Design a binder for these strands. Structure first.
Lengths: 46, 270
RNA sequence: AGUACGAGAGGACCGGAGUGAACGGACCGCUGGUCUCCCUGCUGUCGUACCAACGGCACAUGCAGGGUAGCUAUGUCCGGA
RNA sequence: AGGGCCAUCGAUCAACGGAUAAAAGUUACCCCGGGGAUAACAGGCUGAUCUCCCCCGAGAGUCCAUAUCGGCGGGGAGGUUUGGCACCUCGAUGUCGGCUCGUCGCAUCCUGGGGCUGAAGAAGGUCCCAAGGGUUGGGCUGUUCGCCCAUUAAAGCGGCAC
RNA sequence: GUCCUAAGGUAGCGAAAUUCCUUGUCGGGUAAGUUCCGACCUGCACGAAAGGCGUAACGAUCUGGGCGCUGUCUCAACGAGGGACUCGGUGAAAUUGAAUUGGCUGUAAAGAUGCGGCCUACCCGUAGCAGGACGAAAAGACCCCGUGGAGCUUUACUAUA
RNA sequence: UGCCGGCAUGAGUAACGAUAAAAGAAGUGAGAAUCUUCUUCGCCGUAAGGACAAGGGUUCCUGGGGAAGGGUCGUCCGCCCAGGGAAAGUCGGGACCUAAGGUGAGGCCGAACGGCGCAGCCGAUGGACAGCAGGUCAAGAUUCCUGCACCGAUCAUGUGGAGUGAUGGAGGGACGCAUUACGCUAUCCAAUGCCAAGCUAUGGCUAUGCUGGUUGGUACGCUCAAGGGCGAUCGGGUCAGAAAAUCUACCGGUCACAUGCCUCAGACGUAUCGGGAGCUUCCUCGGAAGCGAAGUUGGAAACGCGACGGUGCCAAGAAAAGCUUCUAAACGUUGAAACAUGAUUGCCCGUACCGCAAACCGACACAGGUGUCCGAGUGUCAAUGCACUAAGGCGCGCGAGAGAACCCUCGUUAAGGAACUUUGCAAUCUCACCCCGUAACUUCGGAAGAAGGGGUCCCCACGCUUCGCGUGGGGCGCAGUGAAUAGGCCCAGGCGACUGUUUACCAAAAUCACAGCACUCUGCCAACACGAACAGUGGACGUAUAGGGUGUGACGCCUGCCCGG
RNA sequence: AGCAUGACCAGGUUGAAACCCCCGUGACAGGGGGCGGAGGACCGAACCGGUGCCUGCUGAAACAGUCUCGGAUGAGUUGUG
RNA sequence: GGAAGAGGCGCCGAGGGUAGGGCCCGUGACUGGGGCGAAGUCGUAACAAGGUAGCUGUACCGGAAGGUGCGGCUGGAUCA
RNA sequence: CUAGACGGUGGGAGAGGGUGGUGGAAUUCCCGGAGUAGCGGUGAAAUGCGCAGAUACCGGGAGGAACGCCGAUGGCGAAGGCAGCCACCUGGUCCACCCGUGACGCUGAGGCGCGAAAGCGUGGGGAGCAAACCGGAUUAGAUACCCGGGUAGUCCACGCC
């Protein structure tokens, strides 16, 4: 039956996918909360 | 076994109890358009009201009566039920520019005349100043808006007796608010309702309307200790003339003062 | 033993052959099942072109019945004197 | 403005070393901290109440102590009668009952040989001795128990965290 | 008569999914009951709208019986396909101080097998069984202690839209 | 009672996976039982088929080697290694339209971040083909070979000889439910209809006993329109579809139900060339295979095509590109466009693998998993329940013996049929079609498709008989739809008026759940809801026999003294 | 839950309202059936969810299997968003 | 050489049973109603203006006979 | 053949019926007004309204239902039942002038109609008063008779006995 997620990630593009933290300015720092903030790569392009 | 006409009030059949709907209609294809509109159910970043709110929205469309006239000659013929509520809605005619839904007294076959003109025809008419009330029969088009004029949209009541003529110039009663002489200076279309009672006429069971337009309710007492006191006994209620979040179940009155209702007394209901 | 006893109903210290119980085994040859391949009975499908005639499937005999060598109880004998 | 000093006044705070002037109920949905050094179900020191015997004279037995009991009370064995103890058991031992395995003890529930019998027989009434054996099916209940139906030589009592 | 008055019991049922006290008291069903009913009424502390009764079908709700059966219980009986045994490979986890790891009766913070005193076995392998280690798991979460938390409600002290 | 790293022991036992049969010849070589060329067996085949949907991305191949994995292992993998394989103008994105909703400079407001929205883009499965069957290797197909449809398309000549540019109103694509048939073939079935490769000691027949095999769209016909809707030249919108006009709308004649707007499978329905077994051509393995014959007759279901076809119901069923509905400044007289035709086009990406599938999610290749299209068969009221073969998938991550206790699974009983026990859940029993036959209660439509009685196969005087039953003489077995398919029955007492929810894994009940009525308030740019933000709409696009809270919940009679609090 | 586009339902039984002729029938209410076609009806496949035993809790899997039901002309169910 | 007993038989039906229906007598713990007996209980609508002139029709209450909404009626004595 | 029954002409009578506007003394009250201390009601009193302006008095207003006078031995009327203007429709009734059809009729468990007030239901409705319920008060006792309120109700449609 239905799991808890399943494929198809539209709400991880124009919302929470790479370039979608400008729509929410105080999300830009959130996007920048693991790149220009601390070590490590990112989590949207592996 | 009484009114006009066909009420599906099945006297206990099979999962379809005493219904109650429709009438006759010539059955129209489908509406040409439906200006602006938009939708329903919820609004303002939130929701509001947790009672009713089905699927099918709109359809109703405006029904601006007579903003102008000056000479029209109409006719009337077809008709079509449509707005959110079961109430029919007429069909008008003419041939000039717009349509504007118009109102509908009682039903007609193939004829009429119409004029919408100050001093015109005894039968069905529209636009005209206000002092024109010798008898004041069925209205079904009352309205409060100087230039504009519409108001009601329901097959319930729509019949008001007009008072005399004294100072402050006040007349006309209203659907269900006893004795409240209103100030007045507009118009309507003066006509019946067509299937009067037909507005709250009972249904069979539940599950073919309450979803299918509106939504499933017959609740009360959240039994929710937080903001909902009603609920926390062996099975009784004891005291507490409370409704919800202490909103006073009883009358408690309300709106008063106001523009109008400052010379529009007598509004008590039984 | 219809006695000692009992004025009347009835009925022993001794043992005697005799009927029974859950209760030890045994035994197949009195009673029965069990038998999943030995046969007959029947509907549906196929393989033999096709037919008397048969096989694969229907719980690992489909359905009605039958069945030995074996097993055990209701099968029979013995058990405490 | 104030302070201290002389002295002094404001709280059944009568929770009276009170400590704030200042405040309720509820969880068998619970989570944790520990726990029999903080209960309850078994043992356990104990032996209240439990089954059984002992003392002579009042009273039944026609009178008449003991065929059988016994006003009042007196010595205890056992103690699994509902418990008094909170000793290790909360790094956790889950009521009771039901089928079956049941195997122990005897004070003996039914035989046996014996004391007596206010017992003619038939059949019992109480006691002595040891285990050799053995002790149903229905009704209800979760049933320990219990009474109701017929049987049964009779349908046990204390075992075992009943 | 009067206390209380703020008032101050009627439609139905009445050991029925309200009776402690008792399984009530009479009666049907087989012999019979903490049961099903028919009533009586001295119904712990039933009822008026979170009702009372009535009331057909229908609801994987409790109780009585019967109709043929369910052969459950008595002994249940025998057979099968598959696991328990011959052989090739793979074989872990929960857990745990350490085993020349028999018992009594006793003793011990009394539930002792390494303790007392006594008796006793040729040592080992595997099949099978539960009385056994106070069986295993989370340091009972039933409870109490804890000037612990969370959760809900009430006019608890009080904030507050 | 730590944590990781390693050695451990439970111990070699339990177990190899749904218990849905397999033997072997032979290839190979390192021996071979599970590979390969293959005759025999059986399980599924509304499947455990094939294609489309998500997924994995490397599945598929030319094949190759065990270190390790597939819980034996193995000369099998989709392990590991280089290469090979999904060839586009029309099946696929966009651009032409769109419901949740997101977003949208200005703006409606918020302490910022922002929330939202006017002109808008998106966001979808969604509106949009104008070709079908053959010739294809190691894998790919309607793009590769052949008879074949062209929607608008690239230019120019020939009836037009003159029209036309926006968001469009159109007609309409815009379809709700159910029934009935008034239509239908592929496909299926009647095979001796056409042509035959040829026949068996089996016993038996060689002939009305016999394997097998034989149409397709482009095209259009009083032998395709079965079936649903009446057509046209004069005047005007006593003032707006932000103008006009050949859309809509209404008034006066001559046609004025004298005439048509409209199709699923046709009795040329065709040009086509494929077609049984094959001479076998082939190193006479692999199979590359020359060439080639029957162009026929009806009768069974569609969720395939009529399918706004009809009546009826409504809880009253979206705005919607395109042949098609209409043009203003301007454009326009001899050329701009609609016409016929040669020529010309749809861009990159998938089009290969398993696919309700050990390979996609369950810590793994664990007996789990949900969409879409076909869906041979006789038998059977239908039957996708039920037996078995196609095509196709296949013995599943094993193998044998002896098959003690016991153990899960199945069946059959003497003696009683629930005495068993908390109560027949379980167990196990049991419930054909046709006819006649049929209650207390009852809102009579029911309670019962009740109980009960006869038959239903076969030879036959015989129907609408291309298929049932039927007045009869009768045939086999103990019994006859006979295999499989299946309400247990009845009275009564407690709760609920039955369809709905779920203890996501103990527990689905008298519990909540329905109209009716009971208390109302709001009564509008409304009460209320979320929102500090009112912006927002829900309410409804409504203003009341309307909605938010609260009570029981068919219907029938009724519902009360204490407002001290 | 709310929003949209599509979708799933082989039959039998019961077969009611509408339509029609007749009629004891003034009007006319009403009566026969015909077709009609209704009803969270009937068995129950697919489809949604489940009342109880069973194997088994390192078992197949941190998760099931076998048998009995209703929804099945709809307070039905569903793909994706 | 067509044959008696009938030998196999075809619906009748005696007769027993498993079932659904109606009917009948008795039975039945409990309960509603009518009369009997010292006229047992408490009060007293209606007979007289028997304290509302009288019954009744329906309807609620309520120890009871009864209370109250209105109408018919003369079967009401009398001077409303 | 017309005495009966039947229809014609010409007139007249009324509270016969269904519908529509309503005429006004009505009486409870909403409001302003004048603006004092009681009103009310029994045979004696009171719940109530009084210091908030009660009782009453002028006007504006909401309304529902009733229809004095004529009214008497009255009329309509099968009968039940019905006494305001007008109108659409309509029933039964009257003599004279005979017009003719020419026995064409009177009754009749069964049915159809009516269906006195009230009483059922759906929606409406509400001034006056009224079952239940509730007050001051009789008396020993008073769910009667006085007074004081009020729900269905007395009210329009339609289906019941």
């Amino acid at each position: 039956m239905k799991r808890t997620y399943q494929p198809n990630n539209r709400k991880r593009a124009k919302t929470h996918g790479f370039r979608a933290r400008m729509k929410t300015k105080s999300g830009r720092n959130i996007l920048a909360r693991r790149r220009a903030k601390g070590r490590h790569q990112l989590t949207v392009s592996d | 076994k009484k009114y006009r006409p066909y009420t599906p009030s099945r006297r206990q059949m099979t999962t379809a109890d005493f219904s109650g709907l429709t009438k006759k209609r010539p059955e129209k294809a489908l509406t040409e358009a439906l200006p602006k509109t938009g939708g329903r159910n919820n609004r303002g970043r939130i929701t509001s009201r947790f009672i009713g709110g089905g699927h099918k929205r709109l359809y109703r469309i405006i029904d601006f009566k007579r903003r102008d006239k000056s000479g029209v000659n109409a006719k009337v013929a077809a008709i079509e039920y449509d707005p959110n509520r079961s109430a029919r809605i007429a069909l008008l005619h003419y041939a000039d520019g717009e349509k504007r839904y118009i109102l509908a007294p009682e039903g007609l076959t193939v004829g009429a005349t119409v004029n919408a003109g100050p001093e015109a025809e005894p039968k069905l008419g529209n636009a005209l100043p206000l002092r024109f009330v010798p008898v004041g029969a069925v209205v079904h088009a009352l309205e409060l808006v100087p230039g504009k004029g519409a108001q009601l949209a329901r097959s319930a009541g729509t019949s008001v007796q007009v008072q005399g003529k004294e100072s402050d110039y006040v007349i006309v009663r209203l659907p269900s608010g006893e004795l409240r002489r209103v100030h007045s200076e507009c118009y309507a279309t003066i006509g019946a309702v067509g299937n009067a009672e037909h507005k709250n006429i009972v249904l069979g069971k539940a599950g073919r309307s309450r979803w299918l337009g509106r939504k499933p309710h017959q609740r009360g007492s959240a039994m929710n200790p937080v903001d909902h006191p009603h609920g926390g006994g062996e099975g009784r209620t004891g005291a507490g003339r409370v409704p919800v979040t202490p909103w006073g179940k009883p009358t408690k009155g309300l709106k008063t003062r106001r523009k109008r209702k400052t010379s529009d007394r007598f509004i008590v209901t039984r």
